[model samples]
Target: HHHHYSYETFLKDSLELVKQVEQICGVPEALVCVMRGGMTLTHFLSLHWDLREVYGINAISYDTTRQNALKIENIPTIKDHLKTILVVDEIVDSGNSLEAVLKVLQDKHPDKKFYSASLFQKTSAKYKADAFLKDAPEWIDFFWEVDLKNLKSH
Candidate 1:
């Protein structure tokens, strides 16, 4: 069966993951990266972490399906602000996308500190995260992947 996971489960798990990451890192707030599902993740994480400020980044052209940092170059809020930015993503499958994002942010703002977070970190990923929900090549869909049979069959 071609199964798809539910968004609710992903939302819950992601929020909890971000909360734990925040507690561990001792950071009260961070700029959320709207990688693919960043907006939804941001909304969930903010509530869980009690975050007030979140830097929403999006793509300039919708044609570019593969986007890094979203409108990172034009975001006015990021200018001159100084803080350890915790880059959150839905998942890091290849690592190049997230790595590129980090490089861009670093180049634009050298003074700002940096870290990363993701709901799922693929075993294939080269870039590591300070916090994440899981490791290895899990059959991740949405939230329902947690109960997938193939997950255990392997």
Candidate 2:
């Protein structure tokens, strides 16, 4: 029910989003990723950030029908004293969903600092991120799906 764009378009959008993160986090390089759809942004940013490695931390899909935020699956591959960890998610619709994952991050990687980035940010949200690309509008209908053909353009 959302406007969908090819992955290439998504990737371009995501990388630009990461550029914003680099500026905000004030780190020359860092590891990043979103919980679920956010991973797309992380993968996209790695190529642009000039970082040594990009890490993806996410809540694993509970099942095909639902994605439980509490049950998160984190893949921490970034080492070498990564001072900043940026989260790139699709949206912060309710804030609860995004908060849930952030809690997990704080719990697991308390020592490391955090920055938040997204392609879309939901309206009327109290939660704030260090950096984000675009604010999501009400009644958003965007494709969560990715297609390889679209990525070639980037």
Candidate 3:
């Protein structure tokens, strides 16, 4: 069974993660949301924290029905050279997606630094984000996932 959460709980978790990010990473030069799951969460953070620098990079690891090899794409052009960046995602499910995204960013921006934050982290994940709101169960129903019903369609 999936663990369901309300929008209020979702926003609360997001706010918590943003606070943690501020505490640990000092508000970052920019926030890069791993598209598509990270869109809403990152958007909310930008508003609450009054952040202006927000960008997106696409990184994929799962579809509607099954998991597949990770494929990242659609990296947006950065206007300013980033010094410290906080990459945001909804969950650190298997860790492969975050690992892949970080590797790409690290390779692309060797001179800059990158940190990661997620709303949930699987206890058994191989890779862990720098900051996470809480430990996740095996199956989770994030607001976006539930509303869309099929993330691949979005």
Candidate 4:
């Protein structure tokens, strides 16, 4: 069974995530979404955060991971002036992908602070993000993905 994550829930959760992030890390100066899963969440957060700097880095799980090893690409060049950043992903399932993405960013911008945020996280996950709305269930289906797949193929 999979949890169907609705747009309404996402919006409300994003709001809560913002409050939690600010309370914990004092408002990140920028946000980096781990693509392509993090795209929607990060962009929405950028708007809620008063249009703070938003960037993205693409990463894919390597089958050699089938172990959660990610091949990270397209690292965003964050400005030096931005000291704090949040790495956004809609959900933390494997956890390693988000962890890997943050590690790359932190390495590139050693002076900047990077905290991870996801709307939900699996209890079995190894990495725990700095902020999240709730614990993820065994599986989830989001409106963006699920709705698209619902369309009849040509």
- State, as a TM-score between 0 and 1, how close model 3 is to the true structure: 0.85
Model 3, runs deviating above 4 Å: 62-68, 148-154
Expressed as tens digits, the lDDT of each residue in 1-154 for candidate 2 is: 3656555667677767656765676654565565567765666566566665666666543554544434656546556476677766777765665666677777667777777766777667778555666667655545555344456557
Q: In model 2, which regions exceed 4 Å deviation? A: 5-12, 60-69, 75-80, 141-154
The TM-score measured for candidate 1 stands at: 0.68
Q: Write the per-residue lDDT of candidate 3 for residues 1-154, one digit (tens) a residue.
A: 7787668998778777877988987877788899988998889988887879998999865564645657889775655566888899988988999998898888877787889999889998999999998888877777766766655578
lDDT of each: 0.64, 0.64, 0.84, 0.85
lDDT of 3: 0.84
Superposed on all Cα atoms, model 4 deviates from the true structure by an RMSD in Å of 2.4
- With a 3 Å backbone cut-off (N, CA, C), the pairs that clash in candidate 1 are 58-70, 58-71
| Deviation from truth (RMSD, Å), model 1 | 6.9
**Cα error, candidate 1, residue 129 (Å):** 2.5
Q: Which ten residues in a row have the lowest lDDT in candidate 1?
A: 68-77
RMSD of 3: 4.4
Q: lDDT tens string, model 1, 28-127?
A: 4466564455566767766766776777554232345565333343432564654767777777776666666677777777787767787777876788
* Candidate with maximal TM-score: 4
Clashes of 4: 2
